[PDB]
Design a protein around this nucleic acid. Structure first.
Lengths: 68, 48, 107, 220, 72
RNA sequence: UUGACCUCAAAUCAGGUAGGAGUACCCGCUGAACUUAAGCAUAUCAAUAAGCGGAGGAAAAGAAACCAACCGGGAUUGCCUUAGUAACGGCGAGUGAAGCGGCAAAAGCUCAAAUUUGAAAUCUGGUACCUUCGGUGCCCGAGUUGUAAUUUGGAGAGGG
RNA sequence: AUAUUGGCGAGAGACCGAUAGCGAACAAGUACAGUGAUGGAAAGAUGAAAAGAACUUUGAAAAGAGAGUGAAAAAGUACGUGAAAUUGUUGAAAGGGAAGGGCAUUUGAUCAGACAU
RNA sequence: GUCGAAUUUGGGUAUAGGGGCGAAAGACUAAUCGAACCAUCUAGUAGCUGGUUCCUGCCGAAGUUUCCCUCAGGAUAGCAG
RNA sequence: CGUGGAGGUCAGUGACGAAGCCUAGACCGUAAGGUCGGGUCGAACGGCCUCUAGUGCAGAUCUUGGUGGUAGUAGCAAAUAUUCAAAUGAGAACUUUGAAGACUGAAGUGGGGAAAGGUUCCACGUCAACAGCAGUUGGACGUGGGUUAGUCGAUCCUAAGAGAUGGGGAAGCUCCGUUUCAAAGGCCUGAUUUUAUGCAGGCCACCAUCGAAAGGGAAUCCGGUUAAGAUUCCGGAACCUGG
RNA sequence: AAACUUUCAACAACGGAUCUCUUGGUUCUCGCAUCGAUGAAGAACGCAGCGAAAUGCGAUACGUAAUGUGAAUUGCAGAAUUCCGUGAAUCAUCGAAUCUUUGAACGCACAUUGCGCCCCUUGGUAUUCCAGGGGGCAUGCCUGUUUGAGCGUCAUUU
């Protein structure tokens, strides 16, 4: 997630890890709507790499799944 | 010349990297080498 | 020969090359040859011209191969201050910012 | 490198342009390789010879000879009007050769050895090994950055008195070995033998499968 | 005539790049050439030092010391 | 009117399969000239370069339809020899390999042809030490079925 | 079965040392040339360390002159070393269509020895 | 010179190397043509040209003999060290 | 005599300065060469005995790099073609503005395009370079902006032509064939139908597809707008296509 | 007499040789057995707060995960806001992932980002028309499965 990882690793629904993801996303987007001078970004980078942490942690706990 | 993306995108890139040396890199604590060194001049070398 | 695995290796073994000797006191009490120069530590620049001069090794620019000592800094005749890159294994570990990890390591 | 700069697809130009009948290449961009390559006289062309693996790299000498050889200069290790001038620095007791108690075939310690090999009177020389000025020619740049005269060589029988390893200059052997290099390296006649057990007393032990001989009477 | 005066007529082509490689090389009218002759491409080579080297995408067969030798 | 036997297909209907790549070096096919002959055809160059189609960790070869005198020897492979010699040749220029000897590495073996027509094989399902499409089982179900076992250098006997 | 060699890995060399060495020590199979296949380079080094130089001179400005940094700017990102062709300046000398040798000497310039105590 | 017809010309297409195409010149075929261009064979060959790198000291020449598809080479004598 | 390198030994030389470089300065060789001094720089290097080879240059119309005499020379000469004055600038023959004078005088030096070009377009900033004198100016350098569709075009169609598959030649890359060789190719309305899918019947090698920004070819125009677009954006007024 | 001209001095100056430098090359030797339809080699086009390229990477884009190292900073200390005792960008990592548009290239094509067909699920709300997300349709052969073909041909209660 934004951690951790050791965190996102558990355990809310696909419809829970959901608005976590959708959340971080509306983040990244607004985080862009900033776009104004500097720009650091810095936590655009943060929010991003995290966006993925979510994404990846999300595509495994549906895999070990298929693995049953 | 009403182009086609194939040659569009490319046209666009000519632009995107048609730019003078970055200047940060100039002081990367290592070396860096000066001058764009790859420098199309839409009047010297030419596209496709 | 090689000497490039040297002048071109990864931090994961650039610290352990950027190493440093321990204080007589330390090299007696704690009882270890030396170690992997650590940050919040303190030291006393042994044989370099900024000799005997002392203080804390704020940061260590490994990707510059050399560690820096807080107070000991290079002075601009131009109303400005700039650090004086110091070469680790030519100083002397006054006191170590001992941490459970660095601790354990003492073996 | 076989592909030795006959790596261009270049030509001559048919006499008719002032230039000379050497291969040339290109065009265009720039100057070269529109120049003139594939040739010795030019730049980055074949060596003359152009060398090769195939050469006579190794050489062959005969036994009975490398024997009158190794021999010729076992017997240099005595008469040390030479073994003075051939390197090693001696006073060394009125005893050439100059043997050591068959103890040293053990001496599992360096100093106990070194130092021993020293009260054995070798100091004077075990030091010369220590005017070590560092090379010259570009040798350096290629893993050979040393230049230290030769030293003291102790003859074994049982082990390598390998305490004497890191010993700076002195070199150990055995009995039925010794390169006709070592036994007078500097490939000149004369080297120091701090000897040993059945060593001096049981060098020969000749044969082998034959050997030895010589003839000029009273060497006077 | 044969030269200058002509010459300045170049205005058709031998190119349109490719889809593989693409160093300008599909005989527009002929179709496919100068390297990956779409189709069967097979690089289409010979014996004369090319390169034709480049970067993969494999070398991750530094596995080996870890194939089923560290895959399981 | 209703089953098969048989050649032939059609299925996105099930599941695998190949196809490209590629320095070296291995199996093939296919094939120059330049060159030397002080000419030039013969020929040499050369079973060489180029072209093409196939592998591998090597490949290929290998248990003789061999070498051999008597003497005898005993699958290949490699090396040292054999040997610049037997031969081949405008017998010119040039080609030019073998086989009891010393090494290196060592291995030997299975089919077809013979009977009791198969109780031997694919799967796919249920379950199984093996945790989902999967190492192998068992039972069972469709399918295969001139392809279950002794016997093959030497014979083991093959049968009694 | 040293039965065969340049992709992985690692040892090493009387090998080259930047017009040598693979063409490529370097954003090199690059810049760049050719419709095309192909063809294809030049190019390393301030220092130990940027410590890369904050009045005044026009500044169009670029710089200069002093300044300051350093062990040195006879190290100024035109940066170790900096030969030669070749050019400037200072200094001397010689010249009636020409270049410059060779033997002897005059003159000027300059140098060593011999010092004899 | 010709200037509405064997006209002029864009685009698209077709013919590629002893092969194309040619109201024929040996023309043209990417400035290339009495056989294109690129790479390779390939450092092709060379009885002919050119150059062939540091000192002094010694000795010191041939052009003529004979056989060659030798006539600028080579063998063979003879001269030399 | 001299060179790169290897064995040796001289306990050789040296940051108090090793190489290399610079000297009508000194001395040794008959000479290859050698040795000092002095200036100079910066980390290495030599004598002797031997070993080794990519070991010595003036040439080869030699290689590559660099220079000069030629020489501030040749040269910078295609349309009558240019002028006053401001202004802006450190500086105007050349920049902008004004005025004057003259051209191209609709088969244009004007108003769009093709093909090719890629941002040269527009704004802003500013002159090392480039422009062949100059530069304040530019297409130049720096940072930013601007390409808006049911009706324009491409998309579909067929042209020469190119081309897979039914197959056939070739050791083979591949060659050859779309007009003379199962199952056809599918689709269709009705159909065995409560939404699969036979069937009633029909057309049936359709012998794949690619190939036109000038051919073929559904449907828009007027006005307004910008630093730079526009038959689109936006205003109004439309017509086509599919449902 | 100068200018000029030559000549040799020193100083600059053109030029970049000589000297020493070496994260290259070159040749040696010794281990080792691996590409792809489970989509390779190769190509585009993109991805940093700031980036042109070399480099790494793929819309999870100089990187996600996971390990141990780590124990302390990375793109190491360019700046920069930067963030840290719950483990930071480094190594290893390939007992995980993501892997655009492609290429043996793949439903048809492909100088275009062009053109179809299924199945699932959303809007218009009648499945049959138009738009959204998900899954899918190459070929040659292997083997079984499953339907139908001939006057190849067997036998059946007619």
């Amino acid at each position: 997630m934004a951690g951790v990882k050791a965190y996102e690793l558990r355990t809310k629904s696909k419809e829970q890890l959901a608005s976590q993801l959708v959340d971080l996303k509306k983040e990244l987007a607004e985080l862009k709507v900033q776009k104004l001078s500097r720009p650091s970004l810095p936590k655009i980078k943060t929010v991003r790499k995290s966006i993925a942490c979510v994404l990846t942690v999300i595509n495994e706990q549906q895999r070990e799944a298929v693995r049953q | 010349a009403q182009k086609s993306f194939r040659i569009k995108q490319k046209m666009a890139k000519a632009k995107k990297q048609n730019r003078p040396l970055p200047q940060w890199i100039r002081l990367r604590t290592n070396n860096t080498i000066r001058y764009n060194a790859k420098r199309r001049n839409w009047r010297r070398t030419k596209m496709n | 020969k090689a000497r490039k695995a040297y002048f071109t290796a990864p931090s994961s073994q650039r610290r352990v090359l950027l190493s440093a000797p321990l204080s007589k006191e330390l090299r007696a009490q704690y009882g270890i040859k030396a170690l992997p120069i650590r940050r919040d530590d303190e030291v006393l620049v042994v044989r370099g011209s900024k000799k005997g001069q002392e203080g804390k090794i704020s940061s260590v620019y490994r990707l510059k191969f050399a560690v820096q000592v807080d107070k000991v800094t290079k002075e601009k005749v131009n109303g400005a201050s700039v650090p004086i890159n110091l070469h680790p294994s030519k100083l002397v570990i006054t006191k170590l910012h001992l941490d459970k990890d660095r601790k354990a390591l003492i073996q | 490198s076989e592909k030795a700069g006959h790596q261009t697809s270049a030509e001559s130009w048919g006499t008719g342009r002032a230039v000379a009948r050497i291969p040339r290449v290109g065009g265009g961009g720039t100057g070269r390789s529109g120049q003139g390559a594939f040739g010795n006289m030019c730049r980055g062309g074949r060596m003359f010879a152009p060398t090769k693996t195939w050469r006579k790299w190794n050489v062959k000498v005969n036994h009975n000879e490398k024997r009158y050889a190794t021999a010729s200069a076992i017997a240099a290790t005595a008469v040390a009007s030479l073994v003075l001038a051939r390197g090693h620095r001696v006073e060394k007791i009125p005893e050439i050769p100059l043997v050591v108690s068959t103890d040293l075939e053990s001496i599992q310690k360096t100093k106990e050895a070194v130092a021993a090999l020293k009260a054995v009177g070798a100091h004077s020389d075990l030091l010369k090994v220590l005017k070590s000025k560092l090379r010259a020619g570009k040798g350096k740049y290629r893993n050979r950055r040393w230049r230290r005269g030769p030293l003291v060589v102790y003859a074994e029988d049982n082990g390598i008195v390998k305490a004497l390893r890191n010993v700076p200059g002195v070199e150990t052997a055995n009995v039925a070995s010794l390169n006709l290099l070592q036994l007078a390296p500097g490939a000149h006649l004369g080297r120091f033998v701090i000897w040993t057990e059945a060593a001096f007393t049981k060098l020969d032990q000749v044969w082998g499968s034959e050997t030895v001989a010589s003839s000029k009477v009273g060497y006077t | 005539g044969k030269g200058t005066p002509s010459f300045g007529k170049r205005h058709n082509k031998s190119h349109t790049l490719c889809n593989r490689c693409g160093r300008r090389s599909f005989h527009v009218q002929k179709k496919t050439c100068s390297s990956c002759g779409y189709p069967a491409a097979k690089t289409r080579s010979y014996n004369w030092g090319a390169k034709a080297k480049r970067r993969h995408t494999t070398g991750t067969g530094r596995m080996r010391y870890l194939k089923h030798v560290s895959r399981r």
